[PDB]
Amino acid sequence: ARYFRRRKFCRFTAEGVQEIDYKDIATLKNYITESGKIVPSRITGTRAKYQRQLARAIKRARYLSLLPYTDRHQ
Amino acid sequence: MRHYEIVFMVHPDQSEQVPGMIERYTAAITGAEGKIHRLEDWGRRQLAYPINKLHKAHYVLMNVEAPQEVIDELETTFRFNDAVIRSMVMRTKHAVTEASPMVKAKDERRERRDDFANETADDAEAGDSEEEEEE
Amino acid sequence: SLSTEATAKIVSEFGRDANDTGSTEVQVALLTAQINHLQGHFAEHKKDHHSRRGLLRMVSQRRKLLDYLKRKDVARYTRLIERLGLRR
Amino acid sequence: AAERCADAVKEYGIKNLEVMVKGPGPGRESTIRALNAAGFRITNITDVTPIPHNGCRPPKKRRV
Amino acid sequence: PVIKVRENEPFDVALRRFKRSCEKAGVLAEVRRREFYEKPTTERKRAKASAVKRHAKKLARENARRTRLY
RNA sequence: CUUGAGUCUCGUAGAGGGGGGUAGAAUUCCAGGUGUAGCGGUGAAAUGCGUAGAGAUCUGGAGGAAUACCGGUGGCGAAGGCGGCCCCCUGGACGAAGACUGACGCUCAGGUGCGAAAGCGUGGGGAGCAAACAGGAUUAGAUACCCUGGUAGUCCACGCCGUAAACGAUGUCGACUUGGAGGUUGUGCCCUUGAGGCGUGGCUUCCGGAGCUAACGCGUUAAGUCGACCGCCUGGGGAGUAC
Numbered sequence: 001a002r003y004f005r006r007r008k009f010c011r012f013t014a015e016g017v018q019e020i021d022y023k024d025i026a027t028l029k030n031y032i033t034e035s036g037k038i039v040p041s042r043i044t045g046t047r048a049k050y051q052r053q054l055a056r057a058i059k060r061a062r063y064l065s066l067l068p069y070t071d072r073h074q
Numbered sequence: 075m076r077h078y079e080i081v082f083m084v085h086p087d088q089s090e091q092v093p094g095m096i097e098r099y100t101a102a103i104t105g106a107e108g109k110i111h112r113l114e115d116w117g118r119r120q121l122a123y124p125i126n127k128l129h130k131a132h133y134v135l136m137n138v139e140a141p142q143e144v145i146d147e148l149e150t151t152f153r154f155n156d157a158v159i160r161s162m163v164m165r166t167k168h169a170v171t172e173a174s175p176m177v178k179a180k181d182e183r184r185e186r187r188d189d190f191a192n193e194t195a196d197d198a199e200a201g202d203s204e205e206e207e208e209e
Numbered sequence: 210s211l212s213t214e215a216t217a218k219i220v221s222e223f224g225r226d227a228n229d230t231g232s233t234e235v236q237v238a239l240l241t242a243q244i245n246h247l248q249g250h251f252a253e254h255k256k257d258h259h260s261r262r263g264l265l266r267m268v269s270q271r272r273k274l275l276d277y278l279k280r281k282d283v284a285r286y287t288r289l290i291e292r293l294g295l296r297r
Numbered sequence: 298a299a300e301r302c303a304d305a306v307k308e309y310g311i312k313n314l315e316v317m318v319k320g321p322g323p324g325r326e327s328t329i330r331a332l333n334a335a336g337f338r339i340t341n342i343t344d345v346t347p348i349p350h351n352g353c354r355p356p357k358k359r360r361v
Numbered sequence: 362p363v364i365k366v367r368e369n370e371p372f373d374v375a376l377r378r379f380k381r382s383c384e385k386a387g388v389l390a391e392v393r394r395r396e397f398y399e400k401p402t403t404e405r406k407r408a409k410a411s412a413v414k415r416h417a418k419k420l421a422r423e424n425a426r427r428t429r430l431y
Numbered sequence: 432c433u434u435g436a437g438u439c440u441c442g443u444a445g446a447g448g449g450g451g452g453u454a455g456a457a458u459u460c461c462a463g464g465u466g467u468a469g470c471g472g473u474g475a476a477a478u479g480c481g482u483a484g485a486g487a488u489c490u491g492g493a494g495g496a497a498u499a500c501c502g503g504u505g506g507c508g509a510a511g512g513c514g515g516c517c518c519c520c521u522g523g524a525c526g527a528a529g530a531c532u533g534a535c536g537c538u539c540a541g542g543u544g545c546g547a548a549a550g551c552g553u554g555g556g557g558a559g560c561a562a563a564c565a566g567g568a569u570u571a572g573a574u575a576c577c578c579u580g581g582u583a584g585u586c587c588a589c590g591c592c593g594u595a596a597a598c599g600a601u602g603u604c605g606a607c608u609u610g611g612a613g614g615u616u617g618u619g620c621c622c623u624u625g626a627g628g629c630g631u632g633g634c635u636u637c638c639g640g641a642g643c644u645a646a647c648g649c650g651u652u653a654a655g656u657c658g659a660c661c662g663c664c665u666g667g668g669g670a671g672u673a674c
Contacts, residue, residue: 001621001622001623002620002621002622003620003621003623004621004622004623004624005621005623006621006623006624007622007623007624008622008623008624009624010624010625010626011624011625011626011627012626013626014626015626031501033500035500036500037499037500037501038500038501039500039501040500040501040502040503041501041502041503042503045626047626048503048505048506048614048615048616049444049615049616051501051503052444052445052501052502052505052506054501055500055501055502056501056516058500058501059501059515059516060516060517062454062455062515062516063453063454063455063515063516063517065454069454069455069456070455070456070499070500072455072456
């Protein structure tokens with residue numbers, strides 16, 4: 001019609017722009033295997049821009065010791 | 075100016091000190107005419123992996139606005155200092171920082187992730203301040 | 210590129226009171242202030258070749274707009290060169 | 298190999314085990330199967346295999 | 362792997378290929394060769410070829426329908 | 432005069448460049464604990480390492496290169512080229528609207544400039560790999576393949592000849608000429624209500640039509656229709672050599 005403008009949330013797996021980055025830990029861990037490493041864009045369905053941006057946020061997090069760098073001994 | 079998302083964490087046994095470190099830096103930033111967008115302390119946390127023989131550390135998020143010289147001046151202190159275990163500074167020129175989008179990230183932590191525990195009160199208590207009341 | 214608040218100052222002084230953007234004197238003054246800023250950068254950064262390419266684009270470009278200006282108003286061109294300190 | 302080894306530790310009165318698995322060879326899972334059939338209880342079959350994060354250059358073997 | 366987080370007792374149905382994060386089948390690409398630095402242009406940029414194989418199958422259903430292959 | 436070309440504010444994506452720091456996994460080495468006879472290697476083997484306690488295994492330190500997964504037909508780049516993370520300096524492109532100058536354009540002999548690579552000088556560095564070199568094997572030889580070691584080198588800093596299958600084997604810029612299916616990034620409109628519908632620019636990739644090409648094949652990113660300017664070719668060998 002005219003200016004109601006996107007109430008719904010269901011689309012792409014990334015309809016909101018994920019504007020919390022490396023601080024929402026539970027959002028990150030959805031994209032991390034049990035062996036502690038990032039999964040690919042084809043499996044998660046994240047749009048490619050967001051996916052490159054999520055990878056950066058995961059690496060940021062790993063160096064901050066929020067996320068397992070690897071599962072080694074953990 | 076420029077906006078800096080500073081995260082740093084401090085080794086447990088000197089952590090009991092830490093509002094005194096924050097009180098030193100925040101006056102060092104605002105005395106250089108910066109502004110503190112926010113100080114959220116994240117508390118004591120259990121590391122993802124040990125960092126040089128240590129299993130837990132206490133995490134502090136400062137969001138500074140400041141000129142380039144000032145962040146540089148903080149890093150030289152952080153470098154020569156036993157107390158900091160590891161430190162990170164992110165970004166530079168986003169005005170998105172000013173409107174404080176981690177006001178929510180602090181609240182989201184409080185509602186579910188961060189809860190009552192003994193270690194994060196131990197870290198708070200050094201700076202205990204009674205300089206308010208009218209005379 | 211040059212600082213936004215400095216840029217406001219450059220346009221103000223080498224443009225007319227209409228505050229042009231495109232006028233030839235103003236473009237040459239903007240390039241010049243950027244060449245002088247960059248000339249401080251390539252003191253320390255001797256081996257930066259990919260940014261040096263952009264330098265040679267600014268210098269070449271200025272050189273062309275100077276040709277243009279001298280084909281038009283020779284009074285304005287002789288004035289501009291000395292007010293911005295160009296050559297010897 | 299596993300059953301022979303199982304004899305050597307009988308002198309230590311061991312009954313329960315955890316096992317670390319290490320490398321790309323064959324025998325990798327088949328050795329575990331021999332340990333459980335030795336009468337040992339196995340707690341985790343933790344594969345540990347050591348993986349460079351890109352790291353040092355491999356030899357280039359089988360060459361042309 | 363057999364997997365160490367499934368639940369800890371020996372249950373022998375678990376097929377190790379149908380239980381691998383990554384191990385073997387790419388992971389030891391880094392042993393007994395260095396994949397010569399842009400050898401991958403001819404090893405790995407046969408992505409077009411395997412995307413073609415999927416296109417070919419997706420075509421081949423349709424040509425069999427109009428030709429009546431049975 | 433303003434469509435060309437240039438210019439301003441607001442924004443966006445990216446391994447574009449340079450300088451500094453920093454983190455984990457791993458090969459190695461030294462140190463120490465446990466522990467016993469092979470370990471390592473291949474087609475099989477031997478040289479090697481091992482009963483002076485190896486290999487494996489636990490701890491701690493040292494060092495140097497690379498920087499898993501993410502990574503994709505992906506992306507950026509004048510090209511060669513560039514993938515951890517963090518900051519500092521900085522280049523270029525693209526958009527959306529407004530405005531501004533007014534042909535400032537295109538091409539380029541000579542010319543100056545910019546290198547993958549190995550090579551190269553002087554200084555540092557040396558963990559892995561590894562020409563030369565050695566030893567073992569196969570062979571009728573076997574200066575080779577394969578295996579055990581290993582030097583220069585690769586790595587940094589600064590300087591030198593500028594080579595390449597330096598490529599799309601396709602010179603630049605510009606106009607024009609049916610589409611489909613996909614990547615990717617800005618962006619106008621939608622109860623934005625089906626990882627959905629309509630609108631517009633940027634690059635990018637597989638397919639194919641008219642046409643062209645000897646043919647393969649190209650095909651709106653041309654090898655189609657043309658414009659401008661530059662390079663270059665004139666049978667094979669000899670020769671990209673001699674002087």
